[PDB]
């Protein structure tokens, strides 16, 4: 009579389809998803230091638009800029805005140190009705709008050396007056000019007399520039008019800081990986939530799903 002994393997009633080198559809006993495709929809406030810009762009917080006064000297791992943000101070542009935004984002701090520039020959602290601070005409907190002293204005020539261990970042600008109505009122002459130099660098800017399209009812503009001053170097400001002067410098730091455009709410939770859609888990090696990420994140791929077989071929009974 004897016996029979059969070798075999398990099978499951609910197999999963995976791809292989030789077959785009083969059923295995089990598989696991390698592409993260969902977010909870909130940016977790941990473990990265999140700074919600709220109504303020980084640039507005930097310049010191009154509604951004609460941002002074704050730091961030990730600054979050909201699509509802708006400017509410003097209208301006920044040639190469994107670079200034980037280098500040990356620096990861708004630490500002006031410096005493010898401003004689001019009236400091110019204000405007388009930049209301605490129910009173005002200006960008970090800028000093320099105008005449008794219908007179000599050629400014102020110096400031960098004795620190870090790069100083100076933000400064030039006023472009509407007509002669603000050419002979704040500077007392037909013409003005700004030269901001160092041992290594020179930037010179010409003011432009002309009406612009009104932005929050002002038709003049300010153009914003920057200058980095390294240790051992010195900032120099030759100005004959129209200077929007720095009140000091921002610290430049290096580290892991950045900026992200997102409208996702900030939540009280802990997630290493942030996207504009919200934080996502980072167990999987890939993700198709967003190509924009910050932190320890799965890598962005185009596929919605990639199933890794975690069992044998499923051969039902």
């Amino acid at each position: 009579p004897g016996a029979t002994l059969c070798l075999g393997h398990h099978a499951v009633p609910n197999g999963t389809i995976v791809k292989t080198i030789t077959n785009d559809q083969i059923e295995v006993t089990n598989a696991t998803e390698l592409v993260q495709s969902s977010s909870t929809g909130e940016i977790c406030d941990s473990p990265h230091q999140i700074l919600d810009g709220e109504n303020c762009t980084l640039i507005d917080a930097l310049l010191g638009d009154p509604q951004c006064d609460g941002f002074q000297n704050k730091k961030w791992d990730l600054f979050v800029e909201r699509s509802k943000a708006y400017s509410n101070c003097y209208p301006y542009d920044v040639p190469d805005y994107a670079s200034l935004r980037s280098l500040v984002a990356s620096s990861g701090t708004l630490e500002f140190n006031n410096e005493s520039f010898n401003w004689t020959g001019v009236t400091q602290n110019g204000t405007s009705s388009a930049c209301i601070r605490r129910s009173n005409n005002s200006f960008f907190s970090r800028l000093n709008w320099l105008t005449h002293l008794k219908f007179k204005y000599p050629a400014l020539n102020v110096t400031m050396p960098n004795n620190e261990k870090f790069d100083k970042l100076y933000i400064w600008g030039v006023h472009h007056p509407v007509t002669d109505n603000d050419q002979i009122f704040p500077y007392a002459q037909a013409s003005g000019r700004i030269t901001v130099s160092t041992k290594r660098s020179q930037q010179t800017v010409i003011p432009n007399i002309g009406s612009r399209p009104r932005v929050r009812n002002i038709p003049s503009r300010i153009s914003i520039y920057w200058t980095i001053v390294k240790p051992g170097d010195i900032l120099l400001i030759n100005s004959t008019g129209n200077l929007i002067a720095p009140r000091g410098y921002f610290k430049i730091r290096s580290g892991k800081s950045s900026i992200m455009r997102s409208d996702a709410p900030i939540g009280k939770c802990n997630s290493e990986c942030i996207t504009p859609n919200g934080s996502i888990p980072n167990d999987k090696p890939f993700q198709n939530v967003n190509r924009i990420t910050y932190g320890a994140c799965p890598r962005y791929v185009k596929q919605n799903t990639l199933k890794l077989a975690t069992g044998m071929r499923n051969v039902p009974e």
């Binding site: 009579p1 004897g2 016996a3 029979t4 002994l5 059969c6 070798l7 075999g8 393997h9 398990h10 099978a11 009633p13 995976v18 791809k19 292989t20 080198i21 030789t22 083969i26 295995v28 006993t29 696991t32 592409v35 994107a98 980037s102 984002a105 990356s106 892991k256 800081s257 950045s258 900026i259 290493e272 990986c273 980072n282 167990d283 999987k284 090696p285 890939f286 190509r291 924009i292 990420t293 910050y294 932190g295 320890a296 994140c297 890598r299 962005y300 791929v301 185009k302 596929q303 990639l306 890794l308 077989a309 975690t310 069992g311 044998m312 071929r313 499923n314 051969v315 039902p316 009974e317």
Partner: protein, 173 residues
Amino acid sequence: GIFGAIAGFIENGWEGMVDGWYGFRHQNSEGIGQAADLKSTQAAIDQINGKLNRLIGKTNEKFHQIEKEFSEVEGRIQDLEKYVEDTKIDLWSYNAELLVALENQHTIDLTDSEMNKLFEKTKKQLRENAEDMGNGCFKIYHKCDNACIGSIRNGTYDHDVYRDEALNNRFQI
């Protein structure tokens, strides 16, 4: 697939085997039974866990990068920023596709291998006391009670004990 056991000479899997991936069914004087083989099961599972350890929870930290969405038309520099990112994503997407296809082919083959290895090991153990019926089953040419079957599964079967009985049964007329 590549060894020919799973989805090959083994006609199908056993839904009723829930305590292991590979094992043994038998029929003898005392009935019909099933036991899982833990060593082959664990061999397969360890290899798959090795793949998982390489792929799960292994992410790369990135911080400040380039912008990847744009609200203004700018030309040359923006073309390049977009092209760098689209290039990157296609290369990673390729890596991910190929990785899964290759790993899956390999997982299917290694699991087939583990079935084959257990089969082979069992065949050699039986020596001249059994024949291979071609479907993963051995016809054992001697009385082989539950303890005898146990002895085969545990690697303690002494083929000399049964050899005379088996030869007599095998080479009868």
